[PDB]
Symmetry: C3
């Protein structure tokens, strides 16, 4: 099968970095073309009861702040087997059970700079899409609850330049109109800032859809990290959104926040992020959306890592506001 998401976003960014040239560069209007082509298949092997499944999805063909061009396999790309009895196992490049919940519902609309890859923790809060990963997805037992479980090699291990690995698990529970989410991920042998780290991230969350037209999601994230030199860091974050859908319209208010990081017992002042976002979406077709979105990002003021050099965050480049329109079509 050929499949694709044709998706373009026109976005104006006004930056407030404290330098006018830096404000001018990062800022301006760009087109964020997240269109992608994928190939997929299912296949019943003659001599194996579980059905063979496979997918190869390409990258964004021209995202903003980046050059043109994507290859096949840049996004979720795997082989695997699936069964009605025990769910599906997948090998290759997938979302980690923890990341999947961070991305959806928790990173939309436009909350990703804070809640996705934002944050000041050292090491690796979690992995997002990772190659060399095996992920088991359980069925929806009793039409109520599901389990996601994965282990994989780390970013350096997949280039033969390290021994990092990671494991994660997530569970979902249906409670009438609500879904309770809980997820966990641990990263080991993470080499950065001249140390070897261990990360542990925990997430709990709720999403609800109700027949009156209101839907909401709410998540709490607690990320801990310990270095080989004995320093321990802790960071909190949360994300929530409110949506009222009436006819062909969806109103959404989104908010997320990273809180001040705690290092070895000290609160580092001004290491917190938060973003507030509003989005109005029009269901222009059963297979497409049009949308307008506004967001305000207030990022942290900086922090150094355990090598006495600045630690990169989504706040490095500066505070900014974004006004965007976009379209997404699925085939």
């Amino acid at each position: 099968e050929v499949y694709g998401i044709i998706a373009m976003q026109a976005a104006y960014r006004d930056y407030d970095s404290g330098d006018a040239k830096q404000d001018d560069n990062l800022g301006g209007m760009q087109l964020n073309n997240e269109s992608r082509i994928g190939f997929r298949g299912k296949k019943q092997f003659a001599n194996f009861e579980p059905t063979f499944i496979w997918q190869i999805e390409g990258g964004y063909v021209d995202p903003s702040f980046g050059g043109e061009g994507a290859g096949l396999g840049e996004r979720d790309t795997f082989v695997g087997f699936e069964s009605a009895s025990w769910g599906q196992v997948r090998l290759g490049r997938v979302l980690t059970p923890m990341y999947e919940l961070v991305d959806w519902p928790a990173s939309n609309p436009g909350l990703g700079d804070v809640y996705d890859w934002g944050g000041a923790i050292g090491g690796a809060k979690y992995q997002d899409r990772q190659s060399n990963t095996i992920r088991w997805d359980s069925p929806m037992y009793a039409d109520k609850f599901s389990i996601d479980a994965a282990v994989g090699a780390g970013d350096k291990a997949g280039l033969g330049a390290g021994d990092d690995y990671w494991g994660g698990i997530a569970a979902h529970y249906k409670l009438g109109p609500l879904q309770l989410d809980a997820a966990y991920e641990g990263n080991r042998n993470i080499e950065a800032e001249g140390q070897t780290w261990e990360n542990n991230t925990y997430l709990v969350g709720v999403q609800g859809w109700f027949e009156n037209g209101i839907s909401f999601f709410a998540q709490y994230k607690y990320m801990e990290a310990d270095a080989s030199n004995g320093v321990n860091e802790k960071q909190d974050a949360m994300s929530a959104g409110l949506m009222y859908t009436t006819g062909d319209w969806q109103y959404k208010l989104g908010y997320a926040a990273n809180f001040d990081l705690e290092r070895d017992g000290k609160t580092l002042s001004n290491t917190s992020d938060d973003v507030v976002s509003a989005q109005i979406m029009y269901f222009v077709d059963p297979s497409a959306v049009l949308y307008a979105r506004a967001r305000m990002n207030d990022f942290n003021e900086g922090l150094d890592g355990l090598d006495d050099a600045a630690r990169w965050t989504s706040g490095t480049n500066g505070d900014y506001n974004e006004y965007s329109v976009g379209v997404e079509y699925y085939f």
Copy 2:
């Protein structure tokens, strides 16, 4: 739909750069695999009268002087809407209204080294295929007159490293067997040579097709550029071609030349390029052509920019002659 152009060229180059090792290096026989695969589609949204359109085109799969492999989106890749009433709007990566006329017909056959990206002017004479763009194509009003018009982000802005932008417009008028072309492009906030430039380019041209089998095109290009330190540059260029089409064959003669550059009123000596080109083409199928090509490029001898360092031109590598055989098939 899937579409593609299968295009292979066997080309011999004899260089005259003034160094024999480099003449041996750059010269020789190479294959120019300009093949590309694309996907495109249209869709009628239920709640939007204009027809939705999109295209994702890949790069040359193995061009000469480069490595193998191309990504999806390296070429014309966009979304847009269409109306029979007001034409079509496209957001994404498109040819600029001026570049389209520079490329076709004015760069064929093999005049591109001189007329396309050749030249000595500073800044950016024009953009060619440019990402982060909106381009409107008007209908052929009265089956005679059409407008092509676009505004877009610059090369640096699409990486968040500048605030360069550009606007462009082109118009075509049908006069019996003639089409009159006139185009313009202006680039602003272009950073190069330690300065910030503004470019303004103008083009006029005529192409004609006659029932006896004669066709020709002729273009005149005028590029001026102003740097922030007050230096002003001006350069003229021209391109013309003559073809006699008889039966399954087309004979072609091409010429293009860039003239000496003018900086602050001073003519820079020997900064002019020109190419004479001959091509025989065989219509091997309604969907394919074979061609043979001979081409002679005489390039400028060099110029320094306003940073007292050499300015790169298509003449950097040296004068050269080229003999080509090739095939192009459309599906």
Copy 3:
């Protein structure tokens, strides 16, 4: 048409390099996703008797020791003409006549580090898949005899950075259940280690398939090399495999070895490699296989080139063992 090979390998590698961190980095468990998507077609031109053919095959989508993402055109990608009388000609990216035999049958299962790209000789033993190649494949005359013949530009030459080139020829003769193979390749103008090399490689081999289910292959590879400073190098290599195919299973035992490199008549001690490999295969479907494989690589302990710095070989990273299971699906 679209075609593909969906191929994933889970492999544990135990290195024995003489450094513990290097054993930690290079070794471990990884996923080797050698999946690829391809496009190919044929066309009968109205005015040309031989049929036009073309192919664009993509790279490995997320191989081991590498990052994710592959372009269209990284593998066999060509245009060409084919006729029942005279076979087929191909221009573009293809395997050299010699390389095809080194790869198949002689590199399976897991003999590639030694017999494929392994060895200690200087210059370029052979090309494998190389762009800018014209390769002719003759018909199977009398269902007994076939020829493969190719000439091409070299790896530096395809970037406008050299004048290396190469030509090669191979032939196969079917004798009942045996096939006698002979191949040759000569590379010229190879710039490496501060000299200019000439390599000449010769190959002979036999393949057998018997009605009882036994198949075998065995090849003898002889590599010669001469540098511009007068140095002469010689290396011999060999590969063999034994197979029993019964029902849904095929057992494979493979061995290959490079012998000690001889430079200027003097044998360099411990410049020899060898690999032993066993693989058990399950034909899970007419279109797929599952397999388990174990292999042990013993590589040479080091070698200097003609610039007195280490010459890179397949052993530079260290000895290792590998245990892997995998799946392959064809569509």
